[PDB]
Amino acid sequence: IRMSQILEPSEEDWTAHRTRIVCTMGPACWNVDTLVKMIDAGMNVCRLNFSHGDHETHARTVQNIQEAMKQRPEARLAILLDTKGPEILIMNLLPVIGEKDKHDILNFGIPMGCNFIAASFVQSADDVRYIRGLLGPRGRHIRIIPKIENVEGLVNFDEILAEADGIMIARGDLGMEIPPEKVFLAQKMMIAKCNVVGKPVITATQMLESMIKNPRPTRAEAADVANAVLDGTDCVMLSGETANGEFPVITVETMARICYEAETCVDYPALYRAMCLAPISTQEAVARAAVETAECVNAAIILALTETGQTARLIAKYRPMQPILALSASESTIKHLQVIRGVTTMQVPDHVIRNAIVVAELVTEGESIVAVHNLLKVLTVE
Amino acid sequence: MSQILEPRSEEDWTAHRTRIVCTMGPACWNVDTLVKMIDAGMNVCRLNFSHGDHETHARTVQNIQEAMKQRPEARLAILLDTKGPEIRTGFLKDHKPITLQQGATLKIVTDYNLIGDETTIACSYGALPQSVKPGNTILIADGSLSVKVVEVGSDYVITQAQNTATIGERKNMNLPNVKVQLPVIGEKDKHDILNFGIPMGCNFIAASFVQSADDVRYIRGLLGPRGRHIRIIPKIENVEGLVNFDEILAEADGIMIARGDLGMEIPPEKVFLAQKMMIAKCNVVGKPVITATQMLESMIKNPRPTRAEAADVANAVLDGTDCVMLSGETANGEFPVITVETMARICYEAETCVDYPALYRAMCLAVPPISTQEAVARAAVETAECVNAAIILALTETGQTARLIAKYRPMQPILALSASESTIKHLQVIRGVTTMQVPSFGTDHVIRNAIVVAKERELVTEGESIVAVHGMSSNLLKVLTVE
Amino acid sequence: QILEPRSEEDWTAHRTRIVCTMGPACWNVDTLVKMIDAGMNVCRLNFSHGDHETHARTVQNIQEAMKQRPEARLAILLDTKGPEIRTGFLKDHKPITLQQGATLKIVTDYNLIGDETTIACSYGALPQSVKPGNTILIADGSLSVKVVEVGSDYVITQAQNTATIGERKNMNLPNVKVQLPVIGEKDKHDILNFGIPMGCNFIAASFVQSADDVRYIRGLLGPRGRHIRIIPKIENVEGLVNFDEILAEADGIMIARGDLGMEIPPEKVFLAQKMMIAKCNVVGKPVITATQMLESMIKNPRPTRAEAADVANAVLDGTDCVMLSGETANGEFPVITVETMARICYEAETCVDYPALYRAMCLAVISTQEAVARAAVETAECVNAAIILALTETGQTARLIAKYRPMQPILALSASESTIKHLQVIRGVTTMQVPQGTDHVIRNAIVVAKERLVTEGESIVAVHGMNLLKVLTVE
Amino acid sequence: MSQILEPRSEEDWTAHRTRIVCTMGPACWNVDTLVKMIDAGMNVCRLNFSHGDHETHARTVQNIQEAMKQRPARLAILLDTKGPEIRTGFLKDHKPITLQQGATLKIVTDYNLIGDETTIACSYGALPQSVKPGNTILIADGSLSVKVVEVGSDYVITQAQNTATIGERKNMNLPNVKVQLPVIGEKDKHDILNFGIPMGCNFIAASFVQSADDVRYIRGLLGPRGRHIRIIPKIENVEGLVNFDEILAEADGIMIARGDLGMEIPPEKVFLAQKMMIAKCNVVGKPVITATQMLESMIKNPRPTRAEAADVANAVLDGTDCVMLSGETANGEFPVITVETMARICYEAETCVDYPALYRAMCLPPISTQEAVARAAVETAECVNAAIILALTETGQTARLIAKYRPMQPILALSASESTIKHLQVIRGVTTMQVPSHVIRNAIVVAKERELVEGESIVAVHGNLLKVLTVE
């Protein structure tokens, strides 16, 4: 590799980054016109911060998200409810889900169509079980993403992960609970444990903070974000940068550019062999086979036909160089998938495989395609 | 050191992956003999057209068919082995054998009317003096007499004998390092191909003494649209066939290695190299290879082979042969059935040494830009090991899919499903493959009924894993659980 | 397991080398001694400031610190001033405020006292270098302006953001080559009249833009500066674009991240650092990661999370050295900062897969010397070797082994004073001065490791180039 | 195919790695042809103590010593014991008998009985206490097979499975039955102690080894005076196979007698036994000799058969250290020509050898220091593309450890020890050079003369040290 290749400046290319982007809602990005513009910049998930505001405030946000998707029919934004929880003022030293949090989950989260609950200050697996039970019949389409923000939740992380659907890592908050020289270790460990098990991880806090005021990040900030991507993060999350910042749109597209530059350094063939080293099921074996065949026939796209999302997730876990287009009839599965690195989505009603390749300018005529369902198909665009 | 020594049960040795070709003859003309040979492991019936006529061979075919009616699950392929070019000495005075002294002159003439003596004999090959030059060696009577060419004219050659030997009338002759100018497919061989091979349902033509790709292209042209369901298997028997092997193989559908004949054309210590080289090259492109001649010769008269015979057969299997061939052992021997059992038993012993993971890895490195069909075949073999499948199903019309899987030599049996009767027959020559004919077909119900038939045949138990593959331009890999 | 604090015995044994910048905060001998204890390996003299008299006094303080710590063999690195671009003086020395969208004239007449509308520039070739659309950064990038017009002695620019700037502030010219001598008369004077006589072991050359620059310093050093090694600093696009030709001529590389961030888009600098570290790794040339390391520690006794991660990731990229600048030169906590970096380095070395580092190096790169160095690393892993002995005159044997990043400590044995100092820049190498045959040298070295690194009856791999590999047991 | 079909020069096939053992006898006794066999490829001289007397064998040892004076080549001398033998008795009027298939044949313990077609004697007195109904007895090289139907106190009743004609005092095999006779009897004891030790034999090849006790018995028998002699158990029967692992553990090397194994086990299983045994010797670095049924047709013919050459080739490909000639050199018309042919076959088979695969297979037991250095030396030699490997050794261990990894480059072993030098004539890939007792520079000064190695790289090893030099 020559250096000149690194220094090359393209709208169509960085738009096709693999890492997913979570943006926090707030006064600065609420508007339909801004949300529509953020979708174009690469927004995948909208976070509702229930630390502030009430049900009336967040309802109008959700309606604005809904109207933003009306202008972008090809987009499917997931909505994530981030709890207040039991929240050295530089404040650190109560139930994880109290009456207020429970009211938010039951009487907003469920009826308003939120796809994820990001639960603040989770300390044990019992917390996740409590939330799971809280959701119950009516909330079965909602996924749980605990936030590891303290020593307790770090200590019980394995059992938290086993119960959870995904994880959010709050680095800034962790750095106030453990020594700063060790947070990078904790972050690496947690992402890797999430990766080996195919569960989405979101890297949160202290991302591009200076962009709240500035239209450009620092060298330090960009590099910090890049290493989260190289650690193996599925998602990167903006907080104040989008909620209260002066450049919400420019921040998202900047984030997309950081992600694209970081995914450049990613060794895809070695990432496959590493996941193979760390017996296995039929569906696991077929997903591996699919990823192998895809590089082998130099596939343009991998089609993951899925109802529950498991097939897409299983393939994404092996981090293929090829884009994964997930095809599903389930509306919530499509929403849950917005948090999975390397996956994009298409809603569908065997004709699906043929009719998808028509919609997909993702392919050229005569290019190879690897479709998967306990089966693996290899096709050529006709 | 004692697991090597334990006696092997019929249940075990009948499950060997290597395929057995048996030559038809008076020793196995009988329908009851043929049925027992099926049970012993016979997969292909060779009809040697060096002897017999269209009537006698047609009768043999009826006997094979009658045998197959007693074994309806067996699908014997029929292979026509051509006579091809033959070179023979002439007659001798009073029909009495002659002794040649070492260092003595022997004139060989092209007048085949010439009744010979110890100083002059005839050759059936009229272009002998235009083929052989001074310094060339001529082998007579299975190389028992060796003579060196000293002088050539238009209708004769003068030779010096290199050893002391006694020869009879009409004995065979070899021309080491000289191309034979006789047609590889003469009017008689053409007649055999067109007027027997096609209408009698022969599946393969094994062409004796192929010396160039032109020879194969000629046979293909000869067969034509009417002979399109027939595969061409050149026999490699001399230097010309060795030198032109890559071109021959590119045109061929499979290869037969005739070791004993090669031994009459090149030095003995080079034949083992040519066999390995040729097997490996066939393996690399997934084209079937048959190792033939000098296999279990001692079993023509003995119920047991020698140590060396069995070691020879074993090493052909370890070299990567698809097929092993019996000739006079089945055709004219006292123990045709026991010889097929012994062959099957040796194959099974040799396949014990086979490291399947290492063979798959060797092949992946061997094949360079690979096709969709091959990549799915690779994946199917790899997936089968990974899920510990009992069986691999190859659904195939042309046989390509099954041939591609077999090429990577999986530890599990390949059950090939086809609607094409000729493809079922062509696959009898492919190592590791068993066959099951199905009606024309939608893939899901075909796999479903295949598991039902495979369950009763004791190939799969309920709960076991199965890999199924269907190829051609959509390709498919499917993993299922036996119900 | 990650919540468990490290003891000093653990973290002091980190393998990454530490360069510390000299300055008033670590001027006194006692502070330098504590910094050695904390893990300082190389002393950077920053020749952007001071003179031959003041820097000589610093060297004498370094030497005095070394008398108290006889085991330390600190290398001294001279960092050239190099080319600088600077804004001019302002009316009444008052700082000026530029409003976004407003035009600013930049003139090449450095005698001009500027205002809100017009400022001077020290770089006379500015109109020759810059074209419409080029960005000019002023005062650590706090002000960005875009070129709109070029003239003979002027450039007309549009303010990209609102900012207040003072007098004589730094300027950057992203994507433009600076047509100033990388080694000017002042730099040459420093190299020849301080670098050589004063016992400097490295020249870190600021703002290297071509291999031409390196060939020049080498030619300048000549026979007399033969014991001195050249470490180009890559700080702009030109150094980047020509990186490979620079590396080929160079003895090592210093990466100036903070300065590169003033020259290229920020998202591309982490990429440049990775690519360059890898390239130095493949040819076994030492690389120093520099600037914006533990900056907040100039004022604070602890680093930020982001700072810790940045240093850790440089180690994980494969850096030989990490460098402190202001943190040791002008900071409130020079000693504590060195300890902290040594600790981060030890924590990051925890995440290193050494068998993978050996295997990847074997696929990336064979000379007799390199083969034996390769065989030595593998053999060391094959037996349960405690340390690797590298007998070397030039330091090459030691470097060739270090390149393969063995899990074992490398003890480098040398009679050469300057080789011992050169190796202070090599990751995973510790050094030992020796006068002696190839067998007598291995003997006394085994006894000195016992009085430190080897228990009774452990395997030891010894390597000697001249090319032998020896496997011994401690007895 | 062109590369395969090119005639190999004498310069090339002389440089083969596999070692050749030649059996001594009337056809090769004399110094003249013995010298000519040396530079055909003979590495080891086998003395067959089934025949001849001490004076007869002493004249041979003398002829070897004289031949080595004319080629100063260092031939190992191997003493091959007679061991236990089972034999049929004498016959009526000294005339052969033929037995018809299905016919009854009684076999008796009384060796004084002059036999009929109905009854013969056997020299093995424990026959009726060894063999049981259902066992097979093989007579005269497996010419005749009989099955045991009945056993008495001093007789066995059998049924001929085969029509065959047998003469007097023919050999007998008891497939799957242990021969309850001393493997080393008083006569074998006399041969080893009063010929082997005094006449300068380097190896004892022990016929018909059935137990590891047999090996330990010979070792104690040699004691201090025979400590420079190495023991090669021959594996010839089921007991030898069943006890192979512990036999090999006590052995210095192994001789596989295929032809005799084919008389003791089913023929289709011998190739497995040979493959297993060769591999097990390779794993442990102990030399293995492939003996019997090599180039038998060359007793009468100047050329081998297609099948014979291929059998030899696959022994080399299995990983045999040595191939052995028996009657081809002991008797037979073309002893010299047979050695050349053997060397040429070995050279062709060694063309198929995948050397990078062999090193990685041997690498695929927490290894020792000297083993690690030997691996490193093979790894380095390939990396550096060395001309030769120099192995400095007194016990031979360093040379044997290197050869085990089967390097592409020839191993020149250098030793002060006369016995070590001769012990190494049995190690594939090794050639030897005696050193007076630094030594590397003088070895390179002689290697350059022998056209083996200016500018080339050389890997030298001492066992723990490795060196890479470049010749001037």
Residue numbers in the entry:
A (entry chain D): 19 to 27, 29 to 106, 158 to 160, 193 to 195, 202 to 386, 390 to 460, 466 to 476, 480 to 492, ...
B (entry chain B): 21 to 388, 390 to 462, 464 to 494, 501 to 511
C (entry chain C): 23 to 387, 391 to 460, 463 to 479, 481 to 494, 503 to 511
D (entry chain A): 21 to 92, 94 to 385, 389 to 461, 467 to 482, 484 to 493, 503 to 511
The authors write:
During glycolysis, pyruvate kinase (PK) catalyzes the irreversible phosphorylation of ADP at the expense of phosphoenolpyruvate (PEP), yielding pyruvate and ATP. Previous characterization of cytoplasmic T. gondii pyruvate kinase (TgPK1), using either parasite extracts or a recombinant purified enzyme, indicated that this enzyme was allosterically activated by glucose 6-phosphate (G6P), which enhanced its activity under PEP unsaturated conditions. We solved the structure of two different constructs of TgPK1: the full-length enzyme (Met1 to Glu531 plus its N-terminal 6×His tag), which crystallized in the absence of substrates, effectors or added ions (“full TgPK1”); and an N-terminal truncated version starting at position Ile39 (“truncated TgPK1”).
The full length crystal lacked electron density for the initial 40 residues, the same ones absent in the truncated form. The monomers from the full length TgPK1 structure were all similar to each other, superposing over all atoms with rmsd values under 1 Å. Within the crystal lattice this domain was exposed to a solvent channel and the closest crystallographic neighbor is a C domain from chain C. The missing domain had little to no influence over the quality of the A domain within chain D, whose b-factors were similar to the average of the structure. First, the full length structure showed three monomers in an open inactive conformation and one subunit where there was no electron density for the B domain (disorder likely due to lack of crystal contacts). This is consistent with the B domain existing in solution as a continuum of open conformations. Additional disordered regions included several loops in the full length C domain (Val407-Pro409, Pro480-Thr485 and Lys515-Ser522). In the full length structure the differences between the A–A′ dimer interfaces are smaller when compared to the truncated TgPK1 but in both cases the smaller buried surface is associated with the outlier B domain conformation.
